[PDB]
Amino acid sequence: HFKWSPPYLECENGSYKPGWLVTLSSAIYGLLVPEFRGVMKVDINLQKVDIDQCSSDGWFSGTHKCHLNNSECMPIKGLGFVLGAYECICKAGFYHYVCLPCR
Amino acid sequence: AQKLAEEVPMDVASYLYTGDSHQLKRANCSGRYELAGLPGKWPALASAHPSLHRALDTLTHATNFLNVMLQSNKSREQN
Amino acid sequence: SGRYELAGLPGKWPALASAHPSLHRALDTLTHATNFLNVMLQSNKSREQNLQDDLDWYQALVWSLLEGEPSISRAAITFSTQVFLQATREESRILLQDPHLANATLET
Known part of the structure; x- marks a missing residue:
């Protein structure tokens, strides 16, 4: 099979420039048996990649801003690989990161 | 877990939580990030x-x- | 009758x-x-070794595509x-031969 990889940053011994690099990689199966005869891999910018904190299942989705207390998560859907992008709604009560009941 | 897991990368929490130029425009990294667990469980x-x-398709x-080309008989190594 | 009765375009919409x-899937492959x-035929050093081993490249390409597709x-x-390279996956051997x-x- 191939080799999944990890998001990155444009730096090894420098300041991480724009972009976070998620890689795809594979090992060139040789040629009457096979063996490791090469390795080919690319890396794309995993930095303009919309992410979801309030998704049922997504990128490590944690709705840790509006659980129950008149809670709703009306999130910020697609901008890119950015946090604090899950807006919450205070469901039928007061609003003073505060979602509150009615009197 | 996720909360305690936020104290992971210093001079990157701007790039992590703010996703900001504080950790980017001026922050000495000297190292690439790594989502081997900074992702979800594995999203795969x-x-x-x-x-x-699309990427996997072209891959x-x-x-x-x-593979089939190298699986051609009499691999010459004719580089 | 003869062969290949194409009702091309009579379909809803078109082809x-x-x-x-x-x-x-095939669209992506396409x-x-x-x-x-268009980038490969626009390559440099186009010696056009159509007899030495470019035939291996072409045959591996056309066969492996249906071995992948x-x-x-x-x-x-x-x-x-x-x-x-007129290749047709008969059962698993691409029946290769040389409108x-x-x-x-040529018109377009």
């Missing part, structure tokens, strides 16, 4: 944008191409 | 639409082969750049 393109599928095309 | 997953070629009935690549469609390609 099971929680996928289509672009994952697999080139992969089969070179 | 220019989007209706299926495997359709888009356009990525096409861009691959699922909608794998029959196909060809007939050029002189007829030098035809108005070519006329229309």
Whole structure:
């Protein structure tokens, strides 16, 4: 099979420039048996990649801003690989990161 | 877990939580990031944008191409 | 009768639409082969070794594509750049051998 990889940053011994690099990689199966005869891999910018904190299942989705207390998560859907992008709604009560009941 | 897991990368929490130029425009990194756990459980393109599928498609095309081509008999190593 | 009764375009819409997953699979295979070629045939050092080992490249390409692709009935690549790898997955061996469609390609 191939080799999944990890998001990155444009730096090894420098300041991480724009972009976070998620890689795809594979090992060139040789040629009457096979063996490791090469390795080919690319890396794309995993930095303009919309992410979801309030998704049922997504990128490590944690709705840790509006659980129950008149809670709703009306999130910020697609901008890119950015946090604090899950807006919450205070469901039928007061609003003073505060979602509150009615009197 | 996730909360305690936020104290992971210093001079990057701007790039992590703010996703900001504080950790980017001026912050000495000297090292690339690594989502080997900073992602979800593993999303493995099971929680996928289509672009994952597009990438894997071109991947697999080139992969089969070179494999069958190298699987051609009498591999010459004629580079 | 004769063969190949194409009711081309009588279909709802045309043969220019989007209706299926495997359709888009082959579509991706299609356009990525096409861009691959338009950049590959535009390559440098085009010695055009059409007899030494470029034939291995072409045959591996056309066979492995249906060895990778699922909608794998029959196909060809007939050029002189007829030098035809006319390849059709009979059972698992691409039956290789060397039209108005070519006329229309020359027209457009």
